[PDB]
Amino acid sequence: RPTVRPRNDVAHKQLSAFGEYVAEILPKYVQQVQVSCFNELEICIHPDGVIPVLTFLRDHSNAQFKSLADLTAVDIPTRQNRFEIVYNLLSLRFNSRIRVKTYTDELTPIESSVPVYKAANWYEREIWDMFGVFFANHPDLRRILTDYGFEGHPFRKDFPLSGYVELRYDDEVKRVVAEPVELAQEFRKFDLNSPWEAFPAYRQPP
Amino acid sequence: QLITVDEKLDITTITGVPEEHIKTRKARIFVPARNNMQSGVNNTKKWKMEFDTRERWENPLMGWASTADPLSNLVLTFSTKEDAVAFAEKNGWSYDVEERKVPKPKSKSYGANFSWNKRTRVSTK
Amino acid sequence: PSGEERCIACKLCEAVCPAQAITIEAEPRADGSRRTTRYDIDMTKCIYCGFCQEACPVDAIVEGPNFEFSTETHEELLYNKEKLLNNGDKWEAEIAANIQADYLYR
Amino acid sequence: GLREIRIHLCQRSPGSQGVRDFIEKRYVELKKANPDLPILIRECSDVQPKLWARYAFGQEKNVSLNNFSADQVTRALENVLSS
Amino acid sequence: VYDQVEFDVPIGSRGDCYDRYLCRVEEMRQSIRIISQCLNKMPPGEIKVDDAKVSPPKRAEMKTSMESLIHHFKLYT
Amino acid sequence: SNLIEVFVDGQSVMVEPGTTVLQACEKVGMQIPRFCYHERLSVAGNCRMCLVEIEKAPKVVAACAMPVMKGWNILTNSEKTKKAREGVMEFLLANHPLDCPICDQGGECDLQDQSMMFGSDRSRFLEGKRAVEDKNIGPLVKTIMTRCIQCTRCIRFASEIAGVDDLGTTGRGNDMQVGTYIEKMFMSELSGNIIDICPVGALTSKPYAFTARPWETRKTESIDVMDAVGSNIVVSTRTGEVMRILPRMHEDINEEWISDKTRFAYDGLKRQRLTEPMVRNEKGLLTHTTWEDALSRVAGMLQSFQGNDVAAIAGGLVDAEALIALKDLLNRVDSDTLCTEEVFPTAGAGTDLRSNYLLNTTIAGVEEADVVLLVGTNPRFEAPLFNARIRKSWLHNDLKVALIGSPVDLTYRYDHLGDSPKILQDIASGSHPFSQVLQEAKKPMVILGSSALQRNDGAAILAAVSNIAQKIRTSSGVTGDWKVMNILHRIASQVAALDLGYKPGVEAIQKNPPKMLFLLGADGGCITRQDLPKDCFIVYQGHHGDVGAPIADVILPGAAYTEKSATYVNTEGRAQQTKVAVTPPGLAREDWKIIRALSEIAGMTLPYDTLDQVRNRLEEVSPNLVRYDDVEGANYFQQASELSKLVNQQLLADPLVPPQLTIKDFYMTDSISRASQTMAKCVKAVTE
Amino acid sequence: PTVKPPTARKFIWTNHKFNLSGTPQQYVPYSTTRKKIQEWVPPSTPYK
Amino acid sequence: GVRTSPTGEKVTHTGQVYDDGDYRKVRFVGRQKEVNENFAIDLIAEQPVSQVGSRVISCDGGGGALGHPRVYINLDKETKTGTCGYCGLQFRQQ
Amino acid sequence: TSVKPIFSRDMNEAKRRVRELYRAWYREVPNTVHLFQLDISVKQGRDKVREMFKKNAHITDPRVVDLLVIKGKMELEETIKVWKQRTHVMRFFHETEAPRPKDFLSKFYVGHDP
Numbered sequence A: 001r002p003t004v005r006p007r008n009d010v011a012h013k014q015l016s017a018f019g020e021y022v023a024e025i026l027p028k029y030v031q032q033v034q035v036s037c038f039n040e041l042e043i044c045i046h047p048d049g050v051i052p053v054l055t056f057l058r059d060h061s062n063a064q065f066k067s068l069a070d071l072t073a074v075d076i077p078t079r080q081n082r083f084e085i086v087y088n089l090l091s092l093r094f095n096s097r098i099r100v101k102t103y104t105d106e107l108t109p110i111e112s113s114v115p116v117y118k119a120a121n122w123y124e125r126e127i128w129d130m131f132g133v134f135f136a137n138h139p140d141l142r143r144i145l146t147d148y149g150f151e152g153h154p155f156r157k158d159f160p161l162s163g164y165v166e167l168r169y170d171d172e173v174k175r176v177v178a179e180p181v182e183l184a185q186e187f188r189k190f191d192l193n194s195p196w197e198a199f200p201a202y203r204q205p206p
Numbered sequence B: 001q002l003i004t005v006d007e008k009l010d011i012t013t014i015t016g017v018p019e020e021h022i023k024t025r026k027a028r029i030f031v032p033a034r035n036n037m038q039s040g041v042n043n044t045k046k047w048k049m050e051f052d053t054r055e056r057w058e059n060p061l062m063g064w065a066s067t068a069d070p071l072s073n074l075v076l077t078f079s080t081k082e083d084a085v086a087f088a089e090k091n092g093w094s095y096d097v098e099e100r101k102v103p104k105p106k107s108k109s110y111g112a113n114f115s116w117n118k119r120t121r122v123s124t125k
Numbered sequence C: 001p002s003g004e005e006r007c008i009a010c011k012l013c014e015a016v017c018p019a020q021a022i023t024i025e026a027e028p029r030a031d032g033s034r035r036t037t038r039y040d041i042d043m044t045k046c047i048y049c050g051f052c053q054e055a056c057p058v059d060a061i062v063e064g065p066n067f068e069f070s071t072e073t074h075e076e077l078l079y080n081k082e083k084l085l086n087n088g089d090k091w092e093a094e095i096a097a098n099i100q101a102d103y104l105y106r
Numbered sequence D: 001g002l003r004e005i006r007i008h009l010c011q012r013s014p015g016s017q018g019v020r021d022f023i024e025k026r027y028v029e030l031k032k033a034n035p036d037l038p039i040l041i042r043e044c045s046d047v048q049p050k051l052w053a054r055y056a057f058g059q060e061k062n063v064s065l066n067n068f069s070a071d072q073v074t075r076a077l078e079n080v081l082s083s
Numbered sequence E: 001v002y003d004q005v006e007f008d009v010p011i012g013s014r015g016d017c018y019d020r021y022l023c024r025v026e027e028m029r030q031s032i033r034i035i036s037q038c039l040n041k042m043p044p045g046e047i048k049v050d051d052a053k054v055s056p057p058k059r060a061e062m063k064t065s066m067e068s069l070i071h072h073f074k075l076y077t
Numbered sequence F: 001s002n003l004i005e006v007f008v009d010g011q012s013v014m015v016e017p018g019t020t021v022l023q024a025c026e027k028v029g030m031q032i033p034r035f036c037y038h039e040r041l042s043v044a045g046n047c048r049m050c051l052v053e054i055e056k057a058p059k060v061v062a063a064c065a066m067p068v069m070k071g072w073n074i075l076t077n078s079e080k081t082k083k084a085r086e087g088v089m090e091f092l093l094a095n096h097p098l099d100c101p102i103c104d105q106g107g108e109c110d111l112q113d114q115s116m117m118f119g120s121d122r123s124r125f126l127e128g129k130r131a132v133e134d135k136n137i138g139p140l141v142k143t144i145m146t147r148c149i150q151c152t153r154c155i156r157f158a159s160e161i162a163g164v165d166d167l168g169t170t171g172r173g174n175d176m177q178v179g180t181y182i183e184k185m186f187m188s189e190l191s192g193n194i195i196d197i198c199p200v201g202a203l204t205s206k207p208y209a210f211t212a213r214p215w216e217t218r219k220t221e222s223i224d225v226m227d228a229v230g231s232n233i234v235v236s237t238r239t240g241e242v243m244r245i246l247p248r249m250h251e252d253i254n255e256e257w258i259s260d261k262t263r264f265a266y267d268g269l270k271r272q273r274l275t276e277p278m279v280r281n282e283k284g285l286l287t288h289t290t291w292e293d294a295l296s297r298v299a300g301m302l303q304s305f306q307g308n309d310v311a312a313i314a315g316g317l318v319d320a321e322a323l324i325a326l327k328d329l330l331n332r333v334d335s336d337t338l339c340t341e342e343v344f345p346t347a348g349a350g351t352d353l354r355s356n357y358l359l360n361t362t363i364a365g366v367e368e369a370d371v372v373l374l375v376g377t378n379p380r381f382e383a384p385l386f387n388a389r390i391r392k393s394w395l396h397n398d399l400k401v402a403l404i405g406s407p408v409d410l411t412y413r414y415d416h417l418g419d420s421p422k423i424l425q426d427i428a429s430g431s432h433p434f435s436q437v438l439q440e441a442k443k444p445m446v447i448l449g450s451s452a453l454q455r456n457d458g459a460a461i462l463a464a465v466s467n468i469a470q471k472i473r474t475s476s477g478v479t480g481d482w483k484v485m486n487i488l489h490r491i492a493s494q495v496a497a498l499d500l501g502y503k504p505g506v507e508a509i510q511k512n513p514p515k516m517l518f519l520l521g522a523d524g525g526c527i528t529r530q531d532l533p534k535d536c537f538i539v540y541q542g543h544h545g546d547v548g549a550p551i552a553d554v555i556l557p558g559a560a561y562t563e564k565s566a567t568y569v570n571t572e573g574r575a576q577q578t579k580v581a582v583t584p585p586g587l588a589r590e591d592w593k594i595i596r597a598l599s600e601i602a603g604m605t606l607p608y609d610t611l612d613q614v615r616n617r618l619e620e621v622s623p624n625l626v627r628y629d630d631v632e633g634a635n636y637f638q639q640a641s642e643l644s645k646l647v648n649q650q651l652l653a654d655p656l657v658p659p660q661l662t663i664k665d666f667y668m669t670d671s672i673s674r675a676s677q678t679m680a681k682c683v684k685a686v687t688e
Numbered sequence G: 001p002t003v004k005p006p007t008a009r010k011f012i013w014t015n016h017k018f019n020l021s022g023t024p025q026q027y028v029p030y031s032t033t034r035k036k037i038q039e040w041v042p043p044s045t046p047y048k
Numbered sequence H: 001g002v003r004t005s006p007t008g009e010k011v012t013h014t015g016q017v018y019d020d021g022d023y024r025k026v027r028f029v030g031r032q033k034e035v036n037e038n039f040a041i042d043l044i045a046e047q048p049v050s051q052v053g054s055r056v057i058s059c060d061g062g063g064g065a066l067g068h069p070r071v072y073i074n075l076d077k078e079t080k081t082g083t084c085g086y087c088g089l090q091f092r093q094q
Numbered sequence I: 001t002s003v004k005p006i007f008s009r010d011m012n013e014a015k016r017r018v019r020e021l022y023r024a025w026y027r028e029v030p031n032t033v034h035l036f037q038l039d040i041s042v043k044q045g046r047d048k049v050r051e052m053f054k055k056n057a058h059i060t061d062p063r064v065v066d067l068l069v070i071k072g073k074m075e076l077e078e079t080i081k082v083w084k085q086r087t088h089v090m091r092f093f094h095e096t097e098a099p100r101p102k103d104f105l106s107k108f109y110v111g112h113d114p
């Protein structure tokens, strides 16, 4: 059907079996394994398993995920642990990708994955900068994207879009200064969601 | 090696928010009312947290609406009122919670349109 | 062709604008017509993406062929409805010809 | 001098039983004796019963009526009325 | 449609700046080789999915059909 | 025990007998698409959008109308169901006009959205479309009937909810048209609700026309103050401007309707506004001044006077926070003359017992009553949403309604016993035949209008009505928990003021004229300078320049109900609060803050500096005032009845005549609605 | 335009103008909408 | 429909003009107020009413796909013209 | 109530890290004032350090304290390595901020905000 994305049962079956494989080997840390309708394997783990799970996936002969594609966070305020840590790994040997997810809150450290992937260094600095997730035993944790002395972690859902301060040059003190933000035109909030359900397959129980 | 921390969760000192936008704000926790213009109920599923409205004024140059409120457009979504209340407390915001309003189940009968002896009989279709 | 404005204040351009560069107000005109009383484009917010002219159902807002309109002040780039209508009256001869050349691709 | 009386109590709690008894038995005779004194009886669920006395120039006093008997309630009014 | 065009992947041997420079120059040549195939194998047909709940309808349809106008209105708001 | 088991996509659900297929689906959180069905109207079954497959049944059934049978499996997403929806949507759109860009429904249109979710994505209709002529039905509702999809919602609403049978369908087939046939205006206090329920852009608000799109509006949930019903509303704003007023669903108050005054008087908030402090200049004209200069001038006068020399009157739109702030400030100069414009007889218990002045049965308790006696009230205009409740019980419970007073049109047939106040004594004595109807009743309700108590003999009327209620309770034909006696208020501020200890009426001011008078939004003309000493110092605080302001020595610009978070108590005694939708214009200020700022300048600082603290003060005076959305019961009817018999006062020969007799009297009743150009067009429309 | 002249319209500028920035003819922005809130005007006759 | 206020400021087609005491008009000193001279309300009133021989007529504003969405206009009422909601052209039945 | 610690297992351990950070900031101020050619005195700089520590004096959660110290050490490193410029260091002092009104009347005159 020309407008519909075709399915790939072979990949779905292969990823499901590998998901069970990883779960059987590391039951100490694996909490959930799921495969999407577009065939992406996600492993959900207790945060204590970051180093062992990532190490296993990197060095095991049936895994060989040598490349860390990306490491990022998602802020979901309604969860007790609002931060979801997402590792996207790539295995060149088996031409496959995997996603490992864990969680933390504002005060609970996560273990730095720098020992497993040197790529993780700056990704963890960015996560710390944008979300305030502290990574333990990181070689050099500090801000990377935000201005020096910037207060707050802008990618949190409750951080305002335009922030709290803004900069201008002041002639009296002959330097750039920071002041509380005032907008000539306020950003206009739109309510776009239709009041009619779009996707019955995802309906949540009442 | 876990430790015991009996204190209430309070993160106001490490969120970077200026003081005036913690102590002087009033968060409202509620389920949005159905938009009366439509019958769809899908925008009344989740709990919302919004803050108190502050001044908007006309920009002298263009007449656009200006604001000095950094939280003017801040709306947070929650699965339950308990999650919303929890979030408000750890952030130090004073809040109000409004009980979810659900339509009460109605007794509908098409046959009642043609009642032999009751006022439910309709005069037209 | 009569001189009536094409814009009917549907606000689809304002809704689609990725930069929120469009600001619109409207009311019934003295003849009862649906027409704008404010139509501002902040040309220093605009990203010249053309989404507004795609969204418009009546070909009212377009990006014209002019690109030589730099100014000495910031304020001169905050267009109101008068400025935009004059641009329409100024450039319509070329704008109509360009639309003729490409509308069969739209 | 006294300007206003306000009696708060719950409709159901046993802590307001004495106040409820006082109103049902003696409020009418209280009101006859003091025809020009506001005695604001205000019931609210799950509140602690209380007696508020407002005197001249906005000076107010409150007395707890929790678990008071009816006669104790009667006594507390008389301290306020006399003062 | 990258599985439908032919090209080679340049590979270095020393892992240094010079080999990466040679890899980039050779990739430009391979891009020309791909571009040549794209020009010759360009098929006819439509250019956005014929599904008006995702891709907007043509302007002529939007101005004649009720379904097209509703879908245009909703896709752009 | 009586529940039956049915399945929704194979999921077991237990429902009452008579539950429709559509209702069964909503129990598992699925909403069947609909156009003609509306849960508060009679079933119609004509749009066919709700058709759904029943497993093993060859024919799709109309979910809105079909009762579910035991063991049925409702297939809400099968191919048969989906294809039925697509076909029906295709038929709806075939003749529908291509109006979305110019149509006000666009962006909040059920036809648009259900087309996106359940319809096809294109057209195969190749003919010309139908075009219909427009119908003028008044200044509030614009009609573009080419958009009408013949769902008959407006017809059913007008007949059933409004009790007006002026809408219908004429013609047949594809040419069938909704309207009035003849040129007729549909002017009902509840008429604007047909805009909300019309699923399409066929019926739209004429005042709202073209001004906004739904996605750009900010929604502020608030409370109506145009009457004492406390209808829950949503204030739609955009870029700091109030754009329109919509109903907010509240099952125990206004359901999902609002009156026309609530809906359309907001435009009065854009004119005649007080935006700057004003004092009198040497020539005796009001001129703009600063807040410092204004409050200093007031503070000087307040320091010089004491006791009876200082009085205040509270108007109909005053919030509870301002009420207590002003009472506390005057109490601090030993003034107890805190008056309202609305009168309530202070004889007997007066305001000592809440049950003496509340709608004790509550709004939702009308649906339980079996007889309703109305005395000296036109509830259709005094409390339109409350009258709608009576009609709903009249329609669905066969409620018997009798009236003592002028025979007004209530939109339902009632028993007119007469207009003489003497009829109350007949009923109480047992002579009148209606006395037996009250005795036979299990859950009788007696509602006395607050408008009737504005009379000089209002105390006697209240005693007589209270007397009837007492016989009904003594006879023992009524259960203990059911409450009979009711006062129906018309002023948003009245109940809160009575709770806080204000004196109802201005009688105390007429007895002891003051030297300094506070008019807190008092625009009724109850006290004028013809009733005051020559050099009385009058301070007006409000949001509109109307009646009070032109006679004041000082004007302090306050906030309107859209411009503050303020507590209002409805006729049931239910505390509710507004929320700030837009800030007050110009130099205007929140009402309780002005009094707080004046108190400090006058040397008597009030002990609260925040909204939360002034609300703590309210709790100390009347704890129910901070229990938002709660209806606290009020008892001791017997004690109030005993006190009401101590002083016998004579009924007057005058017949009971409500202030509003026809619709023209409904539209303008307060400063905001008097300043509304839309309300003015309504008065013009129904008179001329 | 000598071979294919443009379509004539009555509202099209007969006289082209070049960039007027920095001259007395420059564009100056302003709000095109009318005042929204109308103030109460006190009476011109005393009666305090 | 350009007219000038007593102060001499041009009134726009939206009715805008700074009042006498408005400081904001200082922005025009040494410069000029941009006003479009072709008031659409006046120009559409110049177009003649089109006489048609049917109860219902359609308008797309001209130019086919270069106009506006096609709408059908009822011409039953004899006391007024049918006006197009998009372009303002008027129609009347013979 | 059983959580993973950041650095300190209890408040006594945490207060040790706080005092060490304060000593580091205290000694750095003279170098900061000289290095950035600041027009404030060393006494003004140390007063600002004291002010910043004292607005957090009420915290009782060792994990929160740890994070304030982690952030406080990041700020110190930014200052000592001169990653900050003059504008960043001067932002603590809010020199171009007109004094905001505190008492009720002053707030009442200027606007609607509490």
Ligand code: SF4
Residues within 6 Å of the ligand: C013, C016, C017, C018, C019, C020, C021, C022, C041, C045, C046, C047, C048, C049, C050, C051, C052, C053, C063
């Ligand atoms: S071209 Fe400019 S005005 Fe148009 S949609 Fe893009 S950003 Fe907005």
Ligand code: SF4
Residues within 6 Å of the ligand: C006, C007, C008, C009, C010, C011, C012, C013, C014, C024, C055, C056, C057, C058, C059, C060, C061, F101
């Ligand atoms: S320019 Fe076009 S899209 Fe924008 S409001 Fe006007 S008619 Fe709508």
Ligand code: SF4
Residues within 6 Å of the ligand: E070, F096, F097, F098, F099, F100, F101, F103, F104, F105, F106, F107, F109, F110, F111, F112, F147, F199, F200, F201, F202
């Ligand atoms: S009623 Fe709905 S579908 Fe019809 S023109 Fe209006 S917005 Fe479009």
Ligand code: SF4
Residues within 6 Å of the ligand: F147, F148, F149, F150, F151, F152, F153, F154, F155, F178, F197, F198, F199, F200, F202, F203
């Ligand atoms: S006017 Fe609206 S509510 Fe009335 S029948 Fe037509 S579509 Fe239904």
Ligand code: FES
Residues within 6 Å of the ligand: F033, F034, F035, F036, F037, F044, F045, F046, F047, F048, F049, F050, F051, F062, F063, F064, F065
């Ligand atoms: S909703 Fe059932 S036929 Fe209309």
Ligand SMILES: [K+]
Residues within 6 Å of the ligand: F105, F194, F195, F196, F197, F198, F199, F200, F201, F202, F203, F204
């Ligand atoms: K409608």
Ligand SMILES: [Zn+2]
Residues within 6 Å of the ligand: H059, H060, H061, H068, H084, H085, H086, H087, H088, H089
């Ligand atoms: Zn047209």
